[PDB]
Amino acid sequence: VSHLSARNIATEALQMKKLHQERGGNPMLAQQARRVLFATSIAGQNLDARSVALLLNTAVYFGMESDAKLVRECIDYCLKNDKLITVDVLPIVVTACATLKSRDAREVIEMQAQKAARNAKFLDAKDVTNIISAFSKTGINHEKLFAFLSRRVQTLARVGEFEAAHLVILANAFSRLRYRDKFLFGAIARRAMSLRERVTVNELVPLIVAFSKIGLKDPKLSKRFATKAMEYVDQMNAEQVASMFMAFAYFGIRYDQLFGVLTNRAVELIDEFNAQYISTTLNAFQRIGINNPELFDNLAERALAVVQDHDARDISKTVTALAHFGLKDEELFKRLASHAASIADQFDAMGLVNTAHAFARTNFLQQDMAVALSERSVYVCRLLDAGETRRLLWALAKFQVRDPKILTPVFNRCLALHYDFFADPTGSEEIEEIFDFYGPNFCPPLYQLYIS
């Protein structure tokens, strides 16, 4: 590997990333790429902008942080030579700097945003999609650039210069940024309709998912999407079935003729369901509101054999969905509680509160999960809303927890947001339960606020 110059290293790093993010995650390719990229330096050699951008991208993708040398040298080069970063290597730099969060990364992202804003009128079919996806990866709120790019996308799509993959990328990129524009999504839908047979199921499912996520509240296109998807049910995979379940729960409109066929196909492939698919299906059923015990029994049974496969998110969603519908499965609940006790350090800020409240709402108390979640609450108290804090406090009061080292953070958080805490009517009953346990002695100022 020593006789390879920096250009060949960049090409092979791009090849390794493409092989790893697409054809399996072989833990061998990742570690070999890490070892090779740990001993490379852009120093004393003249390199093109594209090679430096490729090295930065493939380094950052493989875990390298903003403290590594290669990353620092590439970022310094991107800062010093700004006019050499044309509109062809702008997406690579932006994608690489998306996850890096430092001063130089912010400055580079802003400079590339302004450059793409100025040249938004002279881009072609590839560049608009690549740039908009790259800017959707990072969290930026440059509205004017989005407007210019949407205008250019409409102008290009009027003449018909987009394929199925381009449509999926554009729809996902514009849905991820929460940019609600009716004309742009209408144009994308019309371009897909003109494409006709060139969109297959694999290129159709993400379109529906993104169109539901954006939330246009247009019942004219939802029906057309449902009718188009009705013919493709027999070819779908289990993951696709769960994806359309979630998408048509996001839409909010009831299509019984579609839901029945979806349920039949889901029952057909019950052996291929992982825990993620079961959690997604149960969350979609909770959101849409339909109550179908026949599929629910099979989903609960299949969830019982893949208990070890459950993540924190899957446990949270499954338990909340099961508790909302009033389904009792003592073995599944016990196994899920034990597993949640095992991985208590993987719960995020809101997943912990949802899991604790779902477990406390039904009469199921287990010390193994209770102690773990109560201890873990300290590190997620600071990232909570008023209603979420109220739910967590009620669940903790139901578990009979009295350790001050646990109760001080949640009481501080609920005192800091007292106005929104006491202005939510739906939780009023819960309030009267909480102070029924702790009493006026615990945090007197909160009691004084409660009396007023």
Binding site: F122, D124, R151, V159
Partner: protein, 297 residues
């Protein structure tokens, strides 16, 4: 070779073209889509660039800005298109973005009373042929002749003046060379007159003359590559038979609405030839256009 076009502005499309004839805006948009697709399906054009819509309909005539004579990109005088200056700057930004020239030659603009337009010049073999009509004066003739005409045993460039009447359209719309030896002319009075004048000025010249029907707009990318793609209008089938009979490739295109507004195919596209600067003795690679290993099989 890069070809530049501009999309129509639907909201501000005129209701009734000059002469009071009617136009349908949806069909105009559809026909421009068909034109863009047909241009992209051409093998010779390396890239087709699509500029953003501009409020006026006259912005669809992008070919009026400048002309390509040999290796010189001459900018036309800005005497009658004062409202189109900003459109010309915007077009030049598009040209620069694609890696073309930094700026245009301003030889004609500095000269006084030099009226001319892109469209009266025909890149004939061994030089250009200009037309002496009302839109261009004698000052333009003299300036072009002094700039580009050189007489030599081999470094020879010929400029020809072809007289035409007041009502005749620009020369490029009806008199043009195609293929390598084929002269396509409208079976009209002006076309026959131009053919006769070209034959006379340059005697002992052997090239077939093909007469199309009047009103049949056409476009042919004339170059060494000897591309035979010749775009013609859909309605006229006899011109199509004539072009096919000469050993060419007619590519029918629906051109009704644009014709009804006064815009032809030649006035809707801007063809330019770019190259990459080769620092140091250098010979950039060129794409092949012929067969390989002829001797073996």
């Amino acid at each position: 070779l890069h070809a530049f076009v501009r999309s129509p502005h639907y909201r501000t499309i005129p209701s009734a073209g000059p002469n009071g004839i009617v136009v349908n805006r949806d069909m105009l948009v559809h026909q421009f889509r068909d034109f863009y697709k047909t241009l992209q399906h051409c093998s010779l054009v390396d890239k087709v660039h699509l500029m953003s819509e501009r409020p006026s309909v006259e912005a669809l005539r992008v070919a009026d800005q400048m002309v390509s004579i040999g290796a010189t990109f001459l900018e036309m005088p800005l005497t009658g298109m004062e409202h189109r200056a900003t459109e010309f700057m915007e077009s030049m930004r598009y040209v620069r973005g694609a890696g073309g020239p930094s700026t245009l030659a301003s030889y004609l603009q500095d000269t006084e009373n030099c009226r001319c337009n892109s469209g009266d010049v025909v890149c004939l073999p061994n030089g250009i042929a200009v037309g002496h009509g009302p839109r261009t004066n004698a000052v333009a003739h003299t300036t072009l002749k002094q700039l580009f005409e050189v007489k030599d045993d081999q470094f020879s460039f010929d400029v020809f003046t072809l007289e035409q009447e007041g009502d005749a359209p620009p020369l490029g719309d009806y008199f043009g060379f195609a293929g390598s030896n084929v002269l396509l002319t409208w079976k009209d009075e002006h076309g026959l007159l131009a053919v006769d004048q070209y034959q006379q000025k340059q005697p002992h010249t052997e090239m077939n003359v093909v007469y199309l029907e009047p009103g049949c707009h056409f476009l042919s990318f004339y170059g060494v590559d000897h591309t035979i793609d010749v775009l013609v209008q859909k309605g006229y089938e006899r011109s199509m038979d004539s072009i096919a009979a000469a050993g060419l490739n007619p590519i029918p295109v629906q051109w009704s609405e644009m014709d009804k507004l006064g815009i032809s195919m030649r006035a809707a596209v801007l063809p330019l030839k770019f190259f990459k600067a080769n620092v140091g003795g250098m010979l950039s690679r060129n794409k092949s256009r012929g067969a390989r290993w002829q001797t073996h099989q």
